[PDB]
């Protein structure tokens, strides 16, 4: 992410790291046995067996005391995902339980994030945190080592769709966040990242409202990041999360 700072160790219990082959993505623990990510991460359809999920991580690919590694038993890409439009850009990872019937072993560093209310109307005023291990500036050489997070305001669809922003590229199921001025944004290597936004009606006041999907260039002017709108997909998530 660009324009952010290193996140506190206890700051991101929900975030999950996903490793396979030469690839990496992030995601969010939304229940003890379930991770929500971006479908475009798994576009190439790797085998669950090759997927490794690590919860409770702070440094990308760094072993740590709170860290927990897990296999993936299966995963589902949204049936209407398009690798061209990136509409419907979400996927569910079913974690493999151990012999005790547990998947994620919760602790202060490993906890699920609350799902979005959905019914409540979205507002420009709402503020959100975006997080990830991707590029800290455009043209960056490597991925970050420590998790970065940055604060970004939500952006209404009517203003993100407007022709000076992203125009016709913004479809149902997407959402935008960030400064039209630029400067603060998710970037390449931040795919599958959780956008967590203030929710005044929620008991925790904080819910998962976006999945890092796409944009145009790390933090450029007049170009907010585009996220999957998690509230749009509650029914799909409930339905394929009984599973």
């Amino acid at each position: 992410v660009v324009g952010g700072l290193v996140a506190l160790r206890g700051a991101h219990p929900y975030i999950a790291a996903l490793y396979w082959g030469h690839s990496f993505c992030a995601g969010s623990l939304i229940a003890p046995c379930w991770v929500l990510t971006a479908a475009h991460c798994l576009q190439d359809r790797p085998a669950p067996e090759d997927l490794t999920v690590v919860l409770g991580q702070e440094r990308r690919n760094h072993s740590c005391e709170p860290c927990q590694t897990l296999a993936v038993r299966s995963y589902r890409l949204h049936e209407a995902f398009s690798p061209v439009s990136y509409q419907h850009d979400l996927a569910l990872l079913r974690l493999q339980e151990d012999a005790d019937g547990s998947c994620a072993l919760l602790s202060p560093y490993v906890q699920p994030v609350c799902l979005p209310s959905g019914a409540a109307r979205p507002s420009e005023t709402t503020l959100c945190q975006v997080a990830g291990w991707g590029h800290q500036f455009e043209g960056a050489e490597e991925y970050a080592s420590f998790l970065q997070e940055a604060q970004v305001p939500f952006l209404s669809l009517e203003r993100c769709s407007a022709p000076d922003v992203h125009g016709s590229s913004i479809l149902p199921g997407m959402l935008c966040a960030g400064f039209l001025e630029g400067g603060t944004d998710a970037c390449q290597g931040d795919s599958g990242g959780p956008l967590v936004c203030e929710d005044q009606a929620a008991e925790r006041r904080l819910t998962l409202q976006g999945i890092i999907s796409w944009g145009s260039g790390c933090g450029d002017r007049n170009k907010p990041g585009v996220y999957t709108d998690v509230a749009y997909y509650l029914a799909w998530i409930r339905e394929h999360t009984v599973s």
Binding site: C114, L115, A201, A202, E203, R204
Partner: peptide
């Protein structure tokens, strides 16, 4: 203390 609820307050 138990979980903190994820519900609309």
């Amino acid at each position: 203390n138990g979980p903190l609820s994820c519900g609309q307050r």
